[PDB]
Design a protein around this ligand. Structure first.
Ligand SMILES: *[C@@H]1O[C@H](CO[C@@H]2O[C@@H](C)[C@@H](O)[C@@H](O)[C@@H]2O)[C@@H](O[C@@H]2O[C@H](CO)[C@@H](O)[C@H](O)[C@H]2NC(C)=O)[C@H](O)[C@H]1NC(C)=O
Ligand SMILES: *[C@@H]1O[C@H](CO[C@@H]2O[C@@H](C)[C@@H](O)[C@@H](O)[C@@H]2O)[C@@H](O[C@@H]2O[C@H](CO)[C@@H](O)[C@H](O)[C@H]2NC(C)=O)[C@H](O)[C@H]1NC(C)=O
Ligand SMILES: O=C(CC(c1ccccc1)c1ccccc1)NC[C@H](O)CNCC1CCCCC1
Ligand SMILES: *[C@@H]1O[C@H](CO[C@@H]2O[C@@H](C)[C@@H](O)[C@@H](O)[C@@H]2O)[C@@H](O)[C@H](O)[C@H]1NC(C)=O
Ligand SMILES: *[C@@H]1O[C@H](CO)[C@@H](O)[C@H](O)[C@H]1NC(C)=O
Ligand SMILES: *[C@@H]1O[C@H](CO)[C@@H](O)[C@H](O)[C@H]1NC(C)=O
Ligand SMILES: *[C@@H]1O[C@H](CO)[C@@H](O)[C@H](O)[C@H]1NC(C)=O
Ligand SMILES: [Cl-]
Ligand SMILES: [Cl-]
Ligand SMILES: [Cl-]
Ligand SMILES: [Cl-]
Ligand SMILES: [Cl-]
Ligand SMILES: [Cl-]
Ligand SMILES: [Cl-]
Ligand SMILES: [Cl-]
Ligand code: NA
Length: 527
């Protein structure tokens, strides 16, 4: 029986058998006052002490969120839906520690994604026990508020200041600083890692002065704050808050009185109205996301990045070969997960209008022109593949490359990866390729479990990636030094080398998507 005295009271964990060894798990430790009643829409409050023993023996509630039912019964989408009760009382975190208790272990803190509208730390592909077992690091993950409940912004109004979910994440980092030593962890060796909106959160913690001293290094998988979906302007943030107020019958002339009215609404009334706060949307719509609040974010983050105003440390950044394709089956005409989605030129043009609704006709013609220079113009997958690359390059790859270039210009080691292995267990069809989200299981080491029917080559690849991530967190350098691997070189603004990750041949290349990213980063903003 293992029990740990934290600064707020004793917690009891559970022992787990992983790979013929033991990992101790503390699931569902509270780290803030439940943000209920008058605390809804406020920054999270400090946790009042307790004198009993908290049984941290099961995952806690997930934060309120809509659950999309686009593919009912399909494991490809339902593996992402919350697997605990939805409650506003969701500010809990989880801790995996190796057995026996380590002496001074490096800590990896996961921040899940989900477009800032969904997500929970209890997903099976976020299970930190494999990493604890195999690399003897400590894994932490927290639940943070999402959607309106996490990001509604009446900016300057402390009743709804914005960025509440980001402050949830920060309060959890603060908990690790105060308490992880009691679990055998090293508060001075803390690496944040997250994917998608979680990766954008990680990059915002690099900009936030309150987070500076709460972590050492950062890993950004398929996301960064300069991605077009990742920050909502103050103009949209106020239009969306007032639209949500109109939809719930909460329009009041006193801005503080709107929030009082929204605080008496059921979570479901708020959730069912989150969709319609914008008149036009896309599959990458983020209706309630990070804002420049003057607190977590002191200025527009593109300015902070461009002028070197961020934590100076190492970063690991990367993207997957087919970031875009998942978004095509959530709205592009002619696309299906149940057929090969061969689309015509005309369907490609309608696809562009879906993803770029307020872009001029000339702007959409420029995208078409850049992306239809066929190698083989007889190839019938041509338009299907170009629309995927349009959405992936614009929304993830080019922003991540630009983040890494600007960050490394201020003298820090950066490492960039290109993940191009399609999981053999991937439930989505083959035309969707190496999808958004499907490197996570490799990072968390699920293919290390031989029972799970991943291939042998996939076990090798996961084993290698797990070591690289752990070596980055421990030593700031993501090498696999023992198995004659390819050496991962630093990403420099001039050569811009990156590592490809795959089963067959991990190799070094330069200037990923160079021509595409010139179009998106330099030309497309002008249209
Ligand atoms: C800012 O919001 C207004 C209002 O949005 C409408 O009302 C909300 C309560 C919600 O139901 C939304 O879906 C509505 O669109 C936007 O004004 C609307 O714009 C559309 C398209 O331009 C137009 O067809 C509607 O008639 C407008 N309705 C009203 C009441 O003005 C406005 O576009 C938003 N500003 C943005 C998005 O920049
Ligand atoms: C691929 O499928 C899409 C979606 O159609 C649905 O799924 C299919 C597997 C099949 O079971 C269809 O009967 C389903 O309706 C096809 O696009 C649809 O085409 C119909 C035909 O007129 C149209 O009414 C719908 O609006 C279309 N929906 C979308 C989202 O485009 C598409 O034609 C199929 N492509 C190929 C190459 O077979
Ligand atoms: O997950 C989200 C987030 C959202 C998003 C928006 C902007 C940036 C990044 C992500 C998204 C992601 C993928 C498709 C559509 C939307 N929203 C809930 C929807 O159920 C999407 N299902 C989640 C998974 C679908 C298949 C593979 C990817 C994950
Ligand atoms: C635990 O280790 C501490 C040193 O941590 C190391 O230095 C910092 C700057 C980071 O770069 C981190 O990655 C390193 O692991 C010691 O200061 C501390 O006294 C140690 N405490 C115990 C109990 O062992
Ligand atoms: C916590 O778990 C132990 C052992 O399973 C049990 O004896 C104890 O009563 C539990 N405490 C609470 C508050 O449920
Ligand atoms: C609005 O509500 C707040 C909260 O009680 C109050 O302080 C303020 O005086 C009210 N009136 C105006 C005009 O802000
Ligand atoms: C290196 O190779 C051995 C077998 O030769 C394997 O057991 C080990 O897990 C590998 N390590 C990494 C980090 O890939
Ligand atoms: Cl702004
Ligand atoms: Cl490619
Ligand atoms: Cl061009
Ligand atoms: Cl053609
Ligand atoms: Cl297939
Ligand atoms: Cl095909
Ligand atoms: Cl190799
Ligand atoms: Cl390329
Ligand atoms: Na390429």
């Amino acid at each position: 029986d293992i029990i740990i005295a934290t600064k707020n009271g004793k917690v009891r964990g559970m022992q787990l058998t992983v790979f013929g060894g033991t990992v101790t798990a503390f699931l569902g430790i509270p780290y803030a006052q439940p943000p209920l009643g008058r605390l809804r829409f406020k920054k999270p409050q400090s946790l009042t002490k307790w004198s009993d023993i908290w049984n941290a023996t099961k995952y806690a509630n997930s934060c309120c969120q809509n659950i999309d039912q686009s593919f009912p019964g399909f494991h490809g989408s339902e593996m992402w839906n919350p697997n605990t009760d939805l409650s506003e009382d969701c500010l809990y975190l989880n801790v995996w520690i190796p057995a026996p208790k380590p002496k001074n272990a490096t800590v990896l803190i996961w921040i899940y994604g989900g477009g800032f509208q969904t997500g929970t730390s209890s997903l099976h592909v976020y299970d930190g026990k494999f990493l604890a077992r195999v690399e003897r690091v400590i894994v932490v993950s927290m639940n943070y508020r999402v959607g309106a409940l996490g990001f509604l912004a009446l900016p300057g109004n402390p009743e709804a200041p914005g960025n509440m979910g980001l402050f949830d994440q920060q309060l959890a980092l603060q908990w690790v600083q105060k308490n992880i030593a009691a679990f055998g962890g090293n508060p001075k060796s803390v690496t944040l890692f997250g994917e998608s909106a979680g990766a954008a959160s990680v990059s915002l913690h690099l900009l936030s002065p309150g987070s500076h001293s709460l972590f050492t290094r950062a890993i950004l998988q398929s996301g960064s704050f300069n991605a077009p979906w990742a920050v909502t302007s103050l103009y949209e943030a106020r239009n969306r808050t007032l639209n949500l107020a109109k939809l719930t019958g909460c329009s009041r002339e006193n801005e503080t009185e709107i929030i009082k009215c929204l605080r008496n609404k059921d979570p479901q009334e708020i959730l069912l109205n989150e969709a319609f706060v914008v008149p036009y949307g896309t599959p990458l719509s983020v209706n309630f996301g990070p804002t420049v609040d003057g607190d977590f974010l002191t200025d527009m983050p593109d300015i902070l990045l461009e002028l070197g105003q961020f934590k100076k440390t190492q970063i690991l950044v990367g993207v997957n070969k087919d970031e875009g394709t998942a978004f095509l089956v959530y709205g592009a005409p002619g696309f299906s997960k149940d057929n090969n989605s061969i689309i015509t030129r005309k369907e490609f043009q309608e696809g562009l209008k879906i993803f770029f609704p307020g872009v001029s006709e000339f702007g959409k013609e420029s995208i078409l022109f850049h992306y239809t220079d066929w190698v083989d113009d007889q190839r019938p997958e041509n338009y299907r593949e170009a629309l995927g690359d349009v959405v992936g390059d614009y929304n993830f790859i080019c922003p991540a490359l630009e983040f890494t270039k600007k960050f490394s210009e201020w003298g820090n080691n950066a490492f960039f990866y290109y993940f191009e292995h399609r999981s053999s267990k991937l439930p989505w069809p083959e035309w969707m390729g190496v999808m958004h989200g499907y490197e996570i299981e490799f990072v968390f080491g699920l293919p290390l479990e031989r029972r799970d029917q991943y291939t042998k080559a996939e076990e090798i690849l996961s084993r290698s990636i797990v070591k690289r991530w752990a070596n980055f967190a421990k030593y700031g350098n993501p090498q696999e030094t023992q198995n004659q691997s390819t050496s991962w070189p630093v990403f420099k603004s001039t050569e811009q080398k990156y590592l490809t990750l795959n089963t067959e041949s991990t190799r070094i290349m330069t200037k990923l998507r160079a021509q595409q990213c010139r179009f998106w980063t330099s030309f497309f903003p002008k249209v």
